[PDB]
Amino acid sequence: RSIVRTLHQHKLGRASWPSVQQGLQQSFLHTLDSYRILQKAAPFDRRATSLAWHPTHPSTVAVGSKGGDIMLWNFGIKDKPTFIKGIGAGGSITGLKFNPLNTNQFYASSMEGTTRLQDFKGNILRVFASSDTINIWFCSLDVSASSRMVVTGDNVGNVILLNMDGKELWNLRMHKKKVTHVALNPCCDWFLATASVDQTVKIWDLRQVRGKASFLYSLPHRHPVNAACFSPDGARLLTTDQKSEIRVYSASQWDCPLGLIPHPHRHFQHLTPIKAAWHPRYNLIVVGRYPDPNFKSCTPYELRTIDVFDGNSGKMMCQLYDPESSGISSLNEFNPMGDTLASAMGYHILIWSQEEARTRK
Amino acid sequence: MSYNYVVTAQKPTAVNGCVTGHFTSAEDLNLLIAKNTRLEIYVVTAEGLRPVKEVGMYGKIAVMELFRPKGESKDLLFILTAKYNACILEYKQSGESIDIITRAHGNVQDRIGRPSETGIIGIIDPECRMIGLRLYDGLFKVIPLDRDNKELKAFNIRLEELHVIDVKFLYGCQAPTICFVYQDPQGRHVKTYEVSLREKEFNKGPWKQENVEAEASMVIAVPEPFGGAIIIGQESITYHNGDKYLAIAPPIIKQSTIVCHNRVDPNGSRYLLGDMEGRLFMLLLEKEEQMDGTVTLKDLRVELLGETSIAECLTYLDNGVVFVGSRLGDSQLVKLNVDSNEQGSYVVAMETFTNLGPIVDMCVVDLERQGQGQLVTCSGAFKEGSLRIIRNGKLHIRTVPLYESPRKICYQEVSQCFGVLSSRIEVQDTSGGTTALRPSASTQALSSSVSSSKLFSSSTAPHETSFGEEVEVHNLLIIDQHTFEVLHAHQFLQNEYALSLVSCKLGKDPNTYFIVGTAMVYPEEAEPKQGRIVVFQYSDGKLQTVAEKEVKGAVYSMVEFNGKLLASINSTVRLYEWTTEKELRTECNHYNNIMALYLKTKGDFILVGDLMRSVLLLAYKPMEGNFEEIARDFNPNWMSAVEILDDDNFLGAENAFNLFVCQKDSAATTDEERQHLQEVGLFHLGEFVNVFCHGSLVMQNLGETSTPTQGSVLFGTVNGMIGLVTSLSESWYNLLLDMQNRLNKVIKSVGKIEHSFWRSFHTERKTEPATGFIDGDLIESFLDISRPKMQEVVANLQYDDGSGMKREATADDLIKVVEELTRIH
């Protein structure tokens, strides 16, 4: 629809903002087909399990491993990135988000059973909770700043909710088994999402409920769930299973779904579980693929690659692939800016940014 | 450190809405008009329009509907703002005092939801049993019109139909019943539902879903005696009522989309329809009697009455007179005659009302007197298009009709003329190329020069073109600064769009050139892959092509930069020098952009506005001949315009109708932190800014410094609003903020909207209070309240007059302050 004419029409007031968003979605996809040149790579030891972006800065990123080993890395700096090690055997970090206040801090959840807040120089500022008995540990974690709340999930079915200064008035059990992911809305403050191996995903109202499954809404599934992530706008919930499915539930009547995006991301023991994600400034979805000979493929060619779908339609729009990275992209995360992508594969960190330009004298 | 003051120089003139009724009294026929923050109330008279009231609202009016609940002697008014403030208002007049009473008010915002693509829709049941709103997809919001619903509480009903195009309540239903058109994978359909308040749910409608034309676009609910519903499309008109179906397909309507409707006859026998080409039709319903005394539809006919300005909205007024409310051109009052005139038209214009919008571009020129700046805008669009020349003394506006779309303007003093890009629509002829649909400036110029350029016509894989496609013909017009006559018109190649223009001198060359950026436009390309920079010289009454530069993309921007030319081509920024041999030569390039759309410069510094990477602060380095990335605003913002206030302050406007101001990080201790721009000012303006420019329209008070405000940046908007942004000291900022808070404690807000809420920065991503910007309109509103109200406003107010110690402020002190502020525009 040759954008510039539509931009002029929008300057005339003729064309509406969403039409512009649609055209520029098309443009971003068009240039995303030129990310194919893999810019950068970065290794370290045992598998990757959690990923996070420095929100304000584009080129800095944090990542958490299988062995409690955290890394913080900036691009275009060449100053040999920042590292911190851990026990290395049974201390698998599993949740990692920056501090909204002091970007040189980070929260963390560990297989050891200690929800902590800790600096990138090693000093532990505070432990927030603890199991105090092994075979019961934490798996998931997330944070909200507008309300200044922290939330974290277990391997048994109980979720914990803390304030930024302690003051725990929560820790009722919500599910029967492990809670893989859990998340808060950024544009509201007081409805919550949680996902579980019980084949159900539950939407809470953290201020009203106290009665051990006096919840707000419950959405079922056929299989377990590996992730339940909200939108930036707040009105669209994404849900991603373990066998072959993606579901989109809306603000309007959480129960029924709008659309199913079928795509295989099958679970496995030693593999890192897969986590679909939004793109912050469009209505896109980005996912990693894991072929399945039993899935009814529409395409005759089934390769492991990063797929990019549209949210409110159902079908795909782009596919990223690059040899020398024929591993399986467990984690994929875009920037909050919209100009960069990071991928965490087993024992590998990949950067897919846009390629060659012309030159100056 | 950045503290700003924003003020209206000319309020917006475009009409966003218009309705007729009996609102100010039962006997009067009133017309109420909405201009984006302003509500105008007129009485329709035999001679024209009588102004009765003008008010400002703290909000963008999105819905304006009159209604009369049972027991009310005259209509009430329902209004919804863009920030979802809902209110029911009543007009009250006694003597010379006119007041708008708040009968009901409330915030109907949902905590979550995506606002819909087809925008806000609001409808009222004909029996005033409820209000219905389409705000979010998947829901139909119902506000029961009980007198006790003073908080305007509402309930949501699920809609299975997610993409609603239009909806209306039907007549002749025992319960409120909606009929609406929606689109789904099976096609487009029309469906109805009864509305049950007890269940707060839909029940099965009185007639089944029907298929309609694939481009059915509007629904009209027909009053008794007809009943039923009209479905309006692009090529057909249909009527549905139970077992009744009646369709006509008059070819006359196919040429242009019908876009607005208003009921003319109280019994529904006639309606008027206006299209995007200004054609005005009458649609007539022929009656059929029935044995039981009921009336059914016999037939449908369409009758072309004539041509008007491109209508945003229509209202049949009285005495064969219609008001045509336009946003793209001047509004009008027109007369409808039963017999046609000499040219075959039944339409006669009675009155015209100025619309400056859309203001796509402008410049400032000392047209009449040195130091007395006037603004020259490219105004309007298609056959309504014009140039407008605005000066103060409230203001005088000269109009130069173009009858086509102007795009950009520059001034070239040495030739004493202006260059203006323009474009017109043409449609395919019978056997040949294309033919224009009307005369325009580019077809009525004094002289013309077609482009003989063949820079890439050779060695370029041609792209075919099919029949039926209309084409745009772009031109560069050379316009006399004194007479505004079309001195020359240079037409570019077929499918070549001229997009940008600058007049400037470069290097050591004493000639002055017109520089044009272009793009080859084809419908199916996701991005342009070809463009030119073209250097023209004007001499002997004609444009001569001096030089060209071919590029593999659209030349979105060009700017003169320290005797060099900076240009933005698709993903590249390139700096060219003008050589002694009259050629452009690359000095340096910067690549870290997606699309560099807006450019401004100041000294050796460069402000870059990105499509999606909002802004970048660069410095040119002459001793290295290259670019350095100085800093960036790391917050994403979809820009629409930018301006440099000074070396340290950077102005931005964004697509959510807000302004912001960025600064360098004063508290930066590292190069990394130094690289971060800080958004230090935020303001919900409520308008879409297309252009900033340095200049002023006030007579300059030579030796004007040592003043309450610093700097002057004007901006132009789609709605024709003109505004000024200026800087303030810290003390003045604190004073004005205190004053605004106190006024908000004293001023009665229509609909009970808090000023802080209205001016609060608001997007779908984040909500935060405003900072660093004063709303000068609010400040100026102090001067119109009574003196006791002023005294209360300034009661117990500590104030430092001039230079000295602080003391109690009197009303006259603030009158003096605000009067001084008013003279800056």
PDB file of N, CA, C and O in Angstrom, chain A residues 1-3 5 8 10-14 17 24 30 56-58 187 191 233 235 251 253 256 281-282 357-361, chain B residues 112 114 158 276 327 358 360 407 521-522 525-526 529 587 589 591 612 624-626 634 638 655 672 676 688 690 718 764-765:
ATOM      1  N   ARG A   1       0.811  -1.211   0.000  1.00  0.00           N
ATOM      2  CA  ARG A   1       0.000   0.000   0.000  1.00  0.00           C
ATOM      3  C   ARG A   1       0.858   1.279   0.000  1.00  0.00           C
ATOM      4  O   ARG A   1       0.325   2.365   0.251  1.00  0.00           O
ATOM      5  N   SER A   2       2.173   1.108  -0.251  1.00  0.00           N
ATOM      6  CA  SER A   2       3.174   2.185  -0.420  1.00  0.00           C
ATOM      7  C   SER A   2       3.054   3.325   0.587  1.00  0.00           C
ATOM      8  O   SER A   2       2.698   4.461   0.271  1.00  0.00           O
ATOM      9  N   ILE A   3       3.448   2.976   1.793  1.00  0.00           N
ATOM     10  CA  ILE A   3       3.403   3.679   3.064  1.00  0.00           C
ATOM     11  C   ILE A   3       3.310   5.188   2.981  1.00  0.00           C
ATOM     12  O   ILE A   3       2.441   5.790   3.622  1.00  0.00           O
ATOM     13  N   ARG A   5       2.277   7.364   0.973  1.00  0.00           N
ATOM     14  CA  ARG A   5       0.956   7.899   0.686  1.00  0.00           C
ATOM     15  C   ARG A   5       0.078   7.787   1.920  1.00  0.00           C
ATOM     16  O   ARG A   5      -0.654   8.723   2.262  1.00  0.00           O
ATOM     17  N   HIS A   8       1.040  10.432   4.451  1.00  0.00           N
ATOM     18  CA  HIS A   8       0.464  11.718   4.096  1.00  0.00           C
ATOM     19  C   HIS A   8      -1.011  11.757   4.452  1.00  0.00           C
ATOM     20  O   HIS A   8      -1.493  12.749   5.004  1.00  0.00           O
ATOM     21  N   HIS A  10      -2.466  10.172   6.792  1.00  0.00           N
ATOM     22  CA  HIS A  10      -2.569  10.301   8.238  1.00  0.00           C
ATOM     23  C   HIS A  10      -2.294  11.731   8.661  1.00  0.00           C
ATOM     24  O   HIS A  10      -2.930  12.250   9.585  1.00  0.00           O
ATOM     25  N   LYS A  11      -1.350  12.385   7.990  1.00  0.00           N
ATOM     26  CA  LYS A  11      -1.141  13.802   8.240  1.00  0.00           C
ATOM     27  C   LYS A  11      -2.370  14.612   7.859  1.00  0.00           C
ATOM     28  O   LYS A  11      -2.614  15.678   8.433  1.00  0.00           O
ATOM     29  N   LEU A  12      -3.152  14.130   6.898  1.00  0.00           N
ATOM     30  CA  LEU A  12      -4.400  14.790   6.561  1.00  0.00           C
ATOM     31  C   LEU A  12      -5.515  14.452   7.531  1.00  0.00           C
ATOM     32  O   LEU A  12      -6.575  15.082   7.472  1.00  0.00           O
ATOM     33  N   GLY A  13      -5.305  13.482   8.410  1.00  0.00           N
ATOM     34  CA  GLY A  13      -6.351  12.999   9.273  1.00  0.00           C
ATOM     35  C   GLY A  13      -7.205  11.926   8.654  1.00  0.00           C
ATOM     36  O   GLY A  13      -8.084  11.384   9.333  1.00  0.00           O
ATOM     37  N   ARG A  14      -6.973  11.598   7.388  1.00  0.00           N
ATOM     38  CA  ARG A  14      -7.803  10.615   6.712  1.00  0.00           C
ATOM     39  C   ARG A  14      -7.601   9.235   7.313  1.00  0.00           C
ATOM     40  O   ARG A  14      -8.551   8.603   7.787  1.00  0.00           O
ATOM     41  N   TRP A  17      -4.544   5.857  13.020  1.00  0.00           N
ATOM     42  CA  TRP A  17      -3.276   5.372  13.562  1.00  0.00           C
ATOM     43  C   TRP A  17      -3.094   3.866  13.418  1.00  0.00           C
ATOM     44  O   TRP A  17      -1.992   3.437  13.039  1.00  0.00           O
ATOM     45  N   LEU A  24       3.512  -0.196   9.144  1.00  0.00           N
ATOM     46  CA  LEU A  24       4.854  -0.254   9.685  1.00  0.00           C
ATOM     47  C   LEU A  24       5.167  -1.630  10.231  1.00  0.00           C
ATOM     48  O   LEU A  24       6.332  -2.026  10.261  1.00  0.00           O
ATOM     49  N   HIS A  30       9.459  -6.710   6.698  1.00  0.00           N
ATOM     50  CA  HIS A  30      10.244  -6.673   5.472  1.00  0.00           C
ATOM     51  C   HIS A  30      11.727  -6.527   5.779  1.00  0.00           C
ATOM     52  O   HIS A  30      12.568  -7.193   5.166  1.00  0.00           O
ATOM     53  N   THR A  56      16.498   0.000  29.676  1.00  0.00           N
ATOM     54  CA  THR A  56      16.788   1.303  29.114  1.00  0.00           C
ATOM     55  C   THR A  56      17.816   1.229  28.006  1.00  0.00           C
ATOM     56  O   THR A  56      17.713   1.968  27.025  1.00  0.00           O
ATOM     57  N   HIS A  57      18.787   0.355  28.139  1.00  0.00           N
ATOM     58  CA  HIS A  57      19.901   0.314  27.219  1.00  0.00           C
ATOM     59  C   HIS A  57      19.704  -0.797  26.191  1.00  0.00           C
ATOM     60  O   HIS A  57      19.188  -1.863  26.539  1.00  0.00           O
ATOM     61  N   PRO A  58      20.069  -0.597  24.923  1.00  0.00           N
ATOM     62  CA  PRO A  58      19.714  -1.596  23.918  1.00  0.00           C
ATOM     63  C   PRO A  58      20.659  -2.775  23.860  1.00  0.00           C
ATOM     64  O   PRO A  58      20.243  -3.916  23.649  1.00  0.00           O
ATOM     65  N   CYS A 187       0.159  -2.452  32.886  1.00  0.00           N
ATOM     66  CA  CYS A 187      -0.680  -1.272  32.706  1.00  0.00           C
ATOM     67  C   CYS A 187      -1.794  -1.175  33.725  1.00  0.00           C
ATOM     68  O   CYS A 187      -2.286  -0.073  33.987  1.00  0.00           O
ATOM     69  N   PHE A 191      -4.428  -7.527  38.652  1.00  0.00           N
ATOM     70  CA  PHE A 191      -4.788  -8.885  38.270  1.00  0.00           C
ATOM     71  C   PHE A 191      -3.544  -9.624  37.812  1.00  0.00           C
ATOM     72  O   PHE A 191      -2.648  -9.052  37.189  1.00  0.00           O
ATOM     73  N   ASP A 233      -0.043  -3.964  26.411  1.00  0.00           N
ATOM     74  CA  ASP A 233      -1.265  -3.179  26.508  1.00  0.00           C
ATOM     75  C   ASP A 233      -2.162  -3.701  27.608  1.00  0.00           C
ATOM     76  O   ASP A 233      -2.940  -2.938  28.188  1.00  0.00           O
ATOM     77  N   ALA A 235      -4.421  -6.347  27.424  1.00  0.00           N
ATOM     78  CA  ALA A 235      -5.717  -6.886  27.065  1.00  0.00           C
ATOM     79  C   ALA A 235      -5.635  -8.246  26.400  1.00  0.00           C
ATOM     80  O   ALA A 235      -6.672  -8.889  26.218  1.00  0.00           O
ATOM     81  N   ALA A 251      -9.012  -9.944  27.091  1.00  0.00           N
ATOM     82  CA  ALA A 251      -9.706  -9.268  28.181  1.00  0.00           C
ATOM     83  C   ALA A 251     -11.178  -9.631  28.230  1.00  0.00           C
ATOM     84  O   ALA A 251     -11.749  -9.860  29.301  1.00  0.00           O
ATOM     85  N   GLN A 253     -14.013 -11.779  28.298  1.00  0.00           N
ATOM     86  CA  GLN A 253     -14.421 -13.154  28.574  1.00  0.00           C
ATOM     87  C   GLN A 253     -13.254 -14.125  28.380  1.00  0.00           C
ATOM     88  O   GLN A 253     -13.153 -14.859  27.397  1.00  0.00           O
ATOM     89  N   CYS A 256     -13.396 -18.145  26.801  1.00  0.00           N
ATOM     90  CA  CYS A 256     -13.288 -18.606  25.433  1.00  0.00           C
ATOM     91  C   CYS A 256     -12.062 -17.996  24.763  1.00  0.00           C
ATOM     92  O   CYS A 256     -11.708 -16.850  25.042  1.00  0.00           O
ATOM     93  N   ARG A 281       5.994  -3.350  20.666  1.00  0.00           N
ATOM     94  CA  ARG A 281       5.406  -2.218  19.976  1.00  0.00           C
ATOM     95  C   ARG A 281       4.537  -2.609  18.793  1.00  0.00           C
ATOM     96  O   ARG A 281       4.028  -1.721  18.104  1.00  0.00           O
ATOM     97  N   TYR A 282       4.351  -3.900  18.543  1.00  0.00           N
ATOM     98  CA  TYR A 282       3.439  -4.370  17.513  1.00  0.00           C
ATOM     99  C   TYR A 282       2.523  -5.453  18.069  1.00  0.00           C
ATOM    100  O   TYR A 282       2.486  -5.675  19.282  1.00  0.00           O
ATOM    101  N   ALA A 357      25.858  -2.144   5.935  1.00  0.00           N
ATOM    102  CA  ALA A 357      25.438  -0.866   5.395  1.00  0.00           C
ATOM    103  C   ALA A 357      26.520  -0.439   4.415  1.00  0.00           C
ATOM    104  O   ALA A 357      27.473  -1.179   4.157  1.00  0.00           O
ATOM    105  N   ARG A 358      26.389   0.766   3.874  1.00  0.00           N
ATOM    106  CA  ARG A 358      27.417   1.294   2.984  1.00  0.00           C
ATOM    107  C   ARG A 358      28.502   1.904   3.872  1.00  0.00           C
ATOM    108  O   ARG A 358      28.542   1.594   5.067  1.00  0.00           O
ATOM    109  N   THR A 359      29.379   2.757   3.335  1.00  0.00           N
ATOM    110  CA  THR A 359      30.531   3.230   4.103  1.00  0.00           C
ATOM    111  C   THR A 359      30.784   4.712   3.860  1.00  0.00           C
ATOM    112  O   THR A 359      30.243   5.316   2.929  1.00  0.00           O
ATOM    113  N   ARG A 360      31.609   5.290   4.738  1.00  0.00           N
ATOM    114  CA  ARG A 360      32.099   6.656   4.621  1.00  0.00           C
ATOM    115  C   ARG A 360      33.577   6.640   4.251  1.00  0.00           C
ATOM    116  O   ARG A 360      34.257   5.619   4.397  1.00  0.00           O
ATOM    117  N   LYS A 361      34.065   7.781   3.770  1.00  0.00           N
ATOM    118  CA  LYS A 361      35.467   7.945   3.380  1.00  0.00           C
ATOM    119  C   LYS A 361      36.442   7.530   4.480  1.00  0.00           C
ATOM    120  O   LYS A 361      37.570   7.120   4.204  1.00  0.00           O
TER     121      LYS A 361
ATOM    122  N   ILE B 112      -8.626  -2.687  31.159  1.00  0.00           N
ATOM    123  CA  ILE B 112      -7.872  -3.193  30.029  1.00  0.00           C
ATOM    124  C   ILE B 112      -8.757  -3.187  28.795  1.00  0.00           C
ATOM    125  O   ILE B 112      -9.986  -3.183  28.881  1.00  0.00           O
ATOM    126  N   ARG B 114      -8.092  -3.003  24.093  1.00  0.00           N
ATOM    127  CA  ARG B 114      -7.515  -2.347  22.945  1.00  0.00           C
ATOM    128  C   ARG B 114      -8.574  -1.476  22.295  1.00  0.00           C
ATOM    129  O   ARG B 114      -9.610  -2.014  21.883  1.00  0.00           O
ATOM    130  N   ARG B 158     -21.207  -9.329  25.952  1.00  0.00           N
ATOM    131  CA  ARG B 158     -20.336  -9.927  24.956  1.00  0.00           C
ATOM    132  C   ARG B 158     -20.939  -9.765  23.571  1.00  0.00           C
ATOM    133  O   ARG B 158     -22.144  -9.939  23.370  1.00  0.00           O
ATOM    134  N   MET B 276     -16.879  11.306  -1.043  1.00  0.00           N
ATOM    135  CA  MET B 276     -15.540  11.849  -0.900  1.00  0.00           C
ATOM    136  C   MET B 276     -15.179  12.825  -2.008  1.00  0.00           C
ATOM    137  O   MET B 276     -14.227  13.592  -1.840  1.00  0.00           O
ATOM    138  N   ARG B 327     -13.870  18.625   7.334  1.00  0.00           N
ATOM    139  CA  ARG B 327     -12.591  18.648   8.030  1.00  0.00           C
ATOM    140  C   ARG B 327     -11.422  18.874   7.091  1.00  0.00           C
ATOM    141  O   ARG B 327     -10.395  19.409   7.521  1.00  0.00           O
ATOM    142  N   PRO B 358      -6.249  20.111   6.526  1.00  0.00           N
ATOM    143  CA  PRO B 358      -4.968  19.818   7.170  1.00  0.00           C
ATOM    144  C   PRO B 358      -3.875  20.751   6.708  1.00  0.00           C
ATOM    145  O   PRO B 358      -3.736  21.025   5.521  1.00  0.00           O
ATOM    146  N   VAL B 360      -0.388  20.763   6.034  1.00  0.00           N
ATOM    147  CA  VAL B 360       0.629  19.746   5.789  1.00  0.00           C
ATOM    148  C   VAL B 360       2.041  20.311   5.888  1.00  0.00           C
ATOM    149  O   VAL B 360       2.979  19.571   6.199  1.00  0.00           O
ATOM    150  N   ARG B 407       1.861  20.024  -0.983  1.00  0.00           N
ATOM    151  CA  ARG B 407       2.623  19.139  -0.107  1.00  0.00           C
ATOM    152  C   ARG B 407       3.694  19.854   0.697  1.00  0.00           C
ATOM    153  O   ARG B 407       3.786  19.640   1.905  1.00  0.00           O
ATOM    154  N   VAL B 521       6.852   5.325  -7.334  1.00  0.00           N
ATOM    155  CA  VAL B 521       5.799   4.729  -6.526  1.00  0.00           C
ATOM    156  C   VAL B 521       5.055   3.715  -7.374  1.00  0.00           C
ATOM    157  O   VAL B 521       4.521   4.048  -8.439  1.00  0.00           O
ATOM    158  N   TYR B 522       5.027   2.480  -6.895  1.00  0.00           N
ATOM    159  CA  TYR B 522       4.205   1.423  -7.425  1.00  0.00           C
ATOM    160  C   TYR B 522       3.366   0.837  -6.295  1.00  0.00           C
ATOM    161  O   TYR B 522       3.818   0.821  -5.146  1.00  0.00           O
ATOM    162  N   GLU B 525       4.759  -2.420  -3.805  1.00  0.00           N
ATOM    163  CA  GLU B 525       6.071  -2.470  -3.171  1.00  0.00           C
ATOM    164  C   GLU B 525       5.955  -2.110  -1.697  1.00  0.00           C
ATOM    165  O   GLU B 525       5.348  -1.095  -1.338  1.00  0.00           O
ATOM    166  N   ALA B 526       6.542  -2.954  -0.849  1.00  0.00           N
ATOM    167  CA  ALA B 526       6.506  -2.725   0.592  1.00  0.00           C
ATOM    168  C   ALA B 526       7.405  -1.570   1.018  1.00  0.00           C
ATOM    169  O   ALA B 526       7.333  -1.132   2.169  1.00  0.00           O
ATOM    170  N   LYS B 529      12.347   1.600  -3.626  1.00  0.00           N
ATOM    171  CA  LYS B 529      13.694   1.156  -3.953  1.00  0.00           C
ATOM    172  C   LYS B 529      14.430   2.114  -4.874  1.00  0.00           C
ATOM    173  O   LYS B 529      15.533   1.790  -5.320  1.00  0.00           O
ATOM    174  N   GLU B 587      30.741  13.056   1.576  1.00  0.00           N
ATOM    175  CA  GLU B 587      31.708  13.235   2.648  1.00  0.00           C
ATOM    176  C   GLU B 587      31.624  12.093   3.649  1.00  0.00           C
ATOM    177  O   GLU B 587      32.623  11.421   3.922  1.00  0.00           O
ATOM    178  N   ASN B 589      28.618   9.266   5.884  1.00  0.00           N
ATOM    179  CA  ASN B 589      27.327   8.624   5.984  1.00  0.00           C
ATOM    180  C   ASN B 589      27.110   8.141   7.413  1.00  0.00           C
ATOM    181  O   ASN B 589      28.065   7.839   8.133  1.00  0.00           O
ATOM    182  N   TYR B 591      24.401   5.264   9.331  1.00  0.00           N
ATOM    183  CA  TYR B 591      23.570   4.138   8.933  1.00  0.00           C
ATOM    184  C   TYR B 591      22.638   3.617  10.011  1.00  0.00           C
ATOM    185  O   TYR B 591      21.708   2.872   9.682  1.00  0.00           O
ATOM    186  N   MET B 612      10.987   4.831  13.886  1.00  0.00           N
ATOM    187  CA  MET B 612      10.745   3.914  14.995  1.00  0.00           C
ATOM    188  C   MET B 612      11.829   3.901  16.059  1.00  0.00           C
ATOM    189  O   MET B 612      11.694   3.151  17.030  1.00  0.00           O
ATOM    190  N   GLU B 624      37.240  15.702  11.120  1.00  0.00           N
ATOM    191  CA  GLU B 624      37.289  14.281  10.804  1.00  0.00           C
ATOM    192  C   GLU B 624      36.443  13.911   9.599  1.00  0.00           C
ATOM    193  O   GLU B 624      36.625  12.814   9.058  1.00  0.00           O
ATOM    194  N   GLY B 625      35.544  14.788   9.156  1.00  0.00           N
ATOM    195  CA  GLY B 625      34.700  14.480   8.022  1.00  0.00           C
ATOM    196  C   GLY B 625      33.836  13.262   8.231  1.00  0.00           C
ATOM    197  O   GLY B 625      33.657  12.478   7.297  1.00  0.00           O
ATOM    198  N   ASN B 626      33.312  13.068   9.441  1.00  0.00           N
ATOM    199  CA  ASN B 626      32.468  11.920   9.732  1.00  0.00           C
ATOM    200  C   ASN B 626      31.477  12.287  10.827  1.00  0.00           C
ATOM    201  O   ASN B 626      31.522  13.382  11.397  1.00  0.00           O
ATOM    202  N   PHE B 634      16.356   6.793  24.595  1.00  0.00           N
ATOM    203  CA  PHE B 634      16.159   5.361  24.549  1.00  0.00           C
ATOM    204  C   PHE B 634      14.718   4.959  24.801  1.00  0.00           C
ATOM    205  O   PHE B 634      14.422   3.761  24.803  1.00  0.00           O
ATOM    206  N   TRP B 638       6.912   7.110  18.450  1.00  0.00           N
ATOM    207  CA  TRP B 638       6.588   7.263  17.038  1.00  0.00           C
ATOM    208  C   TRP B 638       6.457   8.748  16.731  1.00  0.00           C
ATOM    209  O   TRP B 638       5.416   9.359  16.982  1.00  0.00           O
ATOM    210  N   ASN B 655       2.661  10.367  17.917  1.00  0.00           N
ATOM    211  CA  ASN B 655       1.428  10.022  17.238  1.00  0.00           C
ATOM    212  C   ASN B 655       0.251   9.913  18.183  1.00  0.00           C
ATOM    213  O   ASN B 655      -0.895   9.918  17.723  1.00  0.00           O
ATOM    214  N   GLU B 672      28.970   6.209  28.677  1.00  0.00           N
ATOM    215  CA  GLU B 672      27.736   5.452  28.497  1.00  0.00           C
ATOM    216  C   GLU B 672      26.538   6.230  29.018  1.00  0.00           C
ATOM    217  O   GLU B 672      25.512   6.327  28.339  1.00  0.00           O
ATOM    218  N   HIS B 676      22.917   8.946  27.054  1.00  0.00           N
ATOM    219  CA  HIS B 676      21.481   8.805  27.268  1.00  0.00           C
ATOM    220  C   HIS B 676      20.846  10.181  27.317  1.00  0.00           C
ATOM    221  O   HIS B 676      21.160  10.988  28.193  1.00  0.00           O
ATOM    222  N   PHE B 688      -2.344  16.578  16.690  1.00  0.00           N
ATOM    223  CA  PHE B 688      -1.307  15.927  15.907  1.00  0.00           C
ATOM    224  C   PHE B 688      -0.526  17.010  15.183  1.00  0.00           C
ATOM    225  O   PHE B 688      -1.057  17.683  14.295  1.00  0.00           O
ATOM    226  N   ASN B 690       2.119  18.290  12.614  1.00  0.00           N
ATOM    227  CA  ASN B 690       2.792  17.911  11.385  1.00  0.00           C
ATOM    228  C   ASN B 690       4.052  18.711  11.130  1.00  0.00           C
ATOM    229  O   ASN B 690       4.891  18.274  10.337  1.00  0.00           O
ATOM    230  N   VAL B 718      -3.162  19.151  12.182  1.00  0.00           N
ATOM    231  CA  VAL B 718      -4.163  18.639  11.254  1.00  0.00           C
ATOM    232  C   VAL B 718      -5.456  19.423  11.386  1.00  0.00           C
ATOM    233  O   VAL B 718      -6.107  19.751  10.389  1.00  0.00           O
ATOM    234  N   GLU B 764      -1.349   3.706  25.400  1.00  0.00           N
ATOM    235  CA  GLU B 764      -1.740   2.345  25.745  1.00  0.00           C
ATOM    236  C   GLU B 764      -0.673   1.630  26.560  1.00  0.00           C
ATOM    237  O   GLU B 764      -0.968   0.588  27.153  1.00  0.00           O
ATOM    238  N   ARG B 765       0.553   2.156  26.597  1.00  0.00           N
ATOM    239  CA  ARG B 765       1.653   1.529  27.316  1.00  0.00           C
ATOM    240  C   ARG B 765       1.847   2.078  28.724  1.00  0.00           C
ATOM    241  O   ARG B 765       2.227   1.319  29.623  1.00  0.00           O
TER     242      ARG B 765
END
